[PDB]
């Protein structure tokens, strides 16, 4: 950062902005397999001025997103994933960089000073985050698409550290697309997989039953395994404990509730960033093991075992003692 | 990979530093002082939980330093303590709907190729129309511009002799900081600032004129100055300004252009180049591009000098 870094931190949102335009405009797609593209032909396809697009490239080359040739311009080694529409980088841009996040960020300091029931997001949109998602078809599919990435990364080691082979019926609460169950079903075949979530239009996948309901109401029983993945961190204590009450109220002993979340550690850039995001969007938070035990104890739950899948991701086995 | 996702999410770093400054917490961190988060929260009526979480994030990104005392600004981020710092003024000026909403529109402005800038597509009125309407933004704009002028003065006076001039006009001079600073070191001259005012500014030994440089420019000045004006305008409009400059000038009169020159040894120019496209449908220019618009406006580039790494001086005559 060359001696003085504070200014580079402040202006570096411009780097995000430039990458976002490159993606949003729909130009990132033409840079597949490290191909060198002629900007004029590219500019001529989408009806953009050559000069403006050539200049945007010059900035993307400087920051190291693009690379320069005698004929054309290509994506760099480290930024190849911008060409792939099913990469964590492309989907992060698609979901995160928009009015829903950026205008809520500009409201965040006002929400800190105005201590009330309203989150920074609700102060802007006048609705809940998920209420707004269900009204906007495009963002929900972008939300689910990016969430699908974070399930696929734990799926490999989740099946290793836990025995789903020993569970007759399995219910995923706030599962969206059953990406957790879909990927589990592929490995652990011949079991009852159920997904409960708010669907305006219901999704379907072979061997997955998509229940349509609200987890603030009593949750259907008959399931040996209940699972909450990245759900509790969307809610404060009053709302989160109320969800666990409905899990505890639905679990006959001999049954387990699975909770997978970004467990806050003393020193994690990823979790801390997401934690401020939760506060901004839902007036919620990421939690420590002791915070989970406390909210678990409130409804009336105990942890048989806790262990980490990744550095950031951790698993908590919960039962109605 | 690690690099690409860090570039994408690093807006959160900007966003966090903005919340810190905007909320008014920044002022209590002067002279490397360590603040008790609890009393800081209690003072501002902020929930301790929410603040200490925000603070933790600033400690991870490196803005703050944790201790037994409490928390302080890091040596490299000290400038958030100073409310007339280039860093602090950049936050106040640049991190707001005006810029961020215009950035979100920027891809639309590319595809929907028309005269309307990303900013015009959001606000329905030009950047300067919007700035003249809002006293808060203009004061912030002028405050941050004043900082960028103050850096130039020292070596601007060394390479160009204002002492040999007596009637000097600053075109789009705003608050007239350029003439205010030069007037202090160079006395007994007629210093005039031409801009769009509502209540014309006041300063000793500085004349402030209400004017439009798209209309014929006042004659009888021997030095005209355009500093960070032409990068707000596309070629046709930039030519109209330089054309009004030529027609105002005679021989034995000189025009000074102080812009961020599009020279690869400049770090910040290409980022500001995209900022100008987004805000004005304008750009920073290569020397060859200035040569182009100067010739069309009937001007000649006499000399070209490097003020410093980013800033450049162009001397123009009529011919
Ligand atoms: N009242 C409610 N009842 C049930 N599900 C709800 C709900 N409010 C929000 N949700 C759902 O809670 C989910 C939180 S995001 C987590 C998605 C999924 N568990 C995963 O890990 O990939 C969203 O899919 C949202 O639709
Ligand atoms: N038509 C017009 N006539 C005169 N001044 C104009 C103008 N349109 C814009 N301006 C002014 O041109 C200036 C451009 S910004 C440059 C400010 C100053 N020269 C500096 O270096 O900091 C603004 O102050 C703006 O108000
Ligand atoms: O940004 C993230 C994120 C980033 C990296 C890794 C991640 O796991 C996440 C994640 O899980 C997550 C989330 O669950 C809900 C959000 O609103 C945002 C994020
Ligand atoms: O952002 C900048 C800027 C940044 C760094 C260094 C700079 O010099 C500038 C600058 O001059 C400038 C400007 O003249 C007009 C603007 O709207 C924005 C900027
Ligand atoms: Cl959660
Ligand atoms: Cl989210
Ligand atoms: Cl402040
Ligand atoms: Cl206190
Ligand atoms: Cl006006
Ligand atoms: Cl300029
Ligand atoms: Cl030339
Ligand atoms: Na105006």
From TrEMBL, chain A:
Keywords: Methyltransferase, S-adenosyl-L-methionine, Transferase. Residues 114-300 form the O-methyltransferase C-terminal domain. Gene3D superfamilies: Vaccinia Virus protein VP39, Winged helix-like DNA-binding domain superfamily/Winged helix DNA-binding domain. SUPFAM superfamilies: S-adenosyl-L-methionine-dependent methyltransferases (SSF53335), Winged helix' DNA-binding domain (SSF46785). GO terms for biological process: methylation. InterPro entries: COMT-like (IPR016461), COMT_C (IPR001077), SAM-dependent_MTases_sf (IPR029063), WH-like_DNA-bd_sf (IPR036388), WH_DNA-bd_sf (IPR036390). One of its GO terms (molecular function) is O-methyltransferase activity. This is Methyltransferase.
């Amino acid at each position: 950062f060359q001696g003085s870094m504070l200014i580079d931190l402040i202006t570096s949102y411009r780097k995000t902005a430039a990458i976002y335009t490159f993606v949003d405009a729909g130009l990132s797609i033409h840079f597949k397999n490290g191909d060198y593209v002629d900007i004029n032909k590219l500019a001529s396809q989408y009806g953009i001025d050559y000069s403006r697009l050539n200049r945007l490239c010059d900035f993307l080359i400087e920051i190291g997103v693009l690379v320069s040739s005698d004929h054309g311009v290509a994506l760099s080694e480290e930024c190849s994933a911008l060409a792939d529409p099913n990469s964590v980088e492309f989907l992060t841009v698609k979901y995160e960089i928009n009015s829903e996040h950026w205008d809520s960020w500009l409201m965040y300091p006002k929400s800190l000073l105005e201590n009330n029931g309203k989150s920074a997001f609700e102060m802007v949109h006048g609705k809940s985050f998920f209420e707004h998602l269900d009204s906007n078809k495009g963002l929900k599919s972008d939300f689910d698409a990016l969430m699908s990435k974070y399930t696929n990364k734990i799926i490999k080691e989740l099946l290793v550290i836990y025995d789903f082979d020993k569970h007759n019926r399995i219910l995923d609460l706030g599962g969206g697309d059953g990406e957790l169950l879909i990927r589990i079903s592929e490995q652990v075949k011949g079991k009852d997989y159920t997904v409960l979530d708010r669907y305006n239009e219901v999704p379907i996948s072979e061997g997955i039953n998509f229940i349509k309901g609200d987890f603030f109401k009593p949750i259907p029983t008959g399931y040996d395994l209940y699972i909450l993945k990245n759900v509790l961190h969307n809610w404060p204590d009053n709302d989160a404990i109320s969800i666990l009450k409905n899990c505890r109220e639905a679990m006959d002993n001999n049954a387990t509730l699975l909770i997978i979340t970004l467990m806050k550690k003393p020193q994690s850039l990823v979790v801390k960033s997401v934690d401020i995001l939760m506060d901004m969007l839902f007036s919620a938070k990421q939690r420590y093991l002791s915070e989970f035990e406390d909210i678990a104890n409130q409804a009336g739950l105990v942890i048989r075992h806790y262990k980490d899948l990744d550095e950031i991701f951790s698993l908590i086995e919960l039962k109605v003692k």
